[PDB]
Amino acid sequence: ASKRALVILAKGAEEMETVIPVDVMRRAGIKVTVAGLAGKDPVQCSRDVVICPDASLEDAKKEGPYDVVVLPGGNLGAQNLSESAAVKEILKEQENRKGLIAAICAGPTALLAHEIGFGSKVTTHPLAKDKMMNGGHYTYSENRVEKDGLILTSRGPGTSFEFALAIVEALNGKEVAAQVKAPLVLK
Amino acid sequence: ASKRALVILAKGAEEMETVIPVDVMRRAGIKVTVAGLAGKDPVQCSRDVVICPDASLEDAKKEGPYDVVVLPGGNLGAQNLSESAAVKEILKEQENRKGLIAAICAGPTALLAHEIGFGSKVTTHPLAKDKMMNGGHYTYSENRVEKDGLILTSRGPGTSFEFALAIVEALNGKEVAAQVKAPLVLK
Ligand SMILES: [Cl-]
């Protein structure tokens, strides 16, 4: 049975942080659903790349639950995720079932907004640190990828491969991650 | 006057190799046109990410010429680029005007197909080397990014940031590339 990933795509998401994990997870044989926060219509990302989601979030939620829920960054994408009652419900359900939650760059600030994973060690983009740390509800890390309790976080576009391969290792194991990694020509 | 980039997007293109250069070039203030080989309609990439191009290639060609023409990889994307008379005409015009041509992963095999840049030092994805080298028309390199004459090449998804920043440096200079690079959290 293949593992399943939900990637929540909002207006202003960082397109690299969306596409790198989608693609790498699919390389790992993970069934990935790219779900549009706002509906089924195409999504204008932070640098104007337009991505057509596989489904609305409304519809994707009905086919849950998922082995991982993935929150890309992009400041305005993260803010949209943070404002969504639907996202809150998805993340709470995922936390309650002890499922993996993964977030990158400004993405982890939606965890704060939704009161998810408090007490965990987390990283973010450096410019998102102060936001994430408001109230001291997490312990901050400068690791390029951090993983504590249910919560897997990472820092930026340049850490997206490392983040995606961490998700792969958590779901499908270290051997699959290594096999996926080799053809990518990573440094 | 901002520099201008044409990124040619074909069915089966590697989505990471498409989105990383688009996004990084836009960060550098380059005006990027994502042009659909087949028309204006959305493009299904190699790992099923669907990207809506800015324009058809037909239309984008009319607004040329461009400071760089960019060929993503993906085997089936590259094959589609290699079969296109429109791409051939674009690359020949770009070569004739001594403009930059950039290609990544299997992308450089379209240069071979279209008889572009013979005699140049080039790199490709390792699995695309034998294709690229058929006839010995180029000199092969294992550098992660290679640049010789008009021709800038690179190896894979994992070299895409390095490739994009090389394009940025060629167009906008080393200082802009360094400024763009810092917030990406590259290794
Ligand atoms: Cl952003």
Ligand SMILES: [Cl-]
């Ligand atoms: Cl491919």
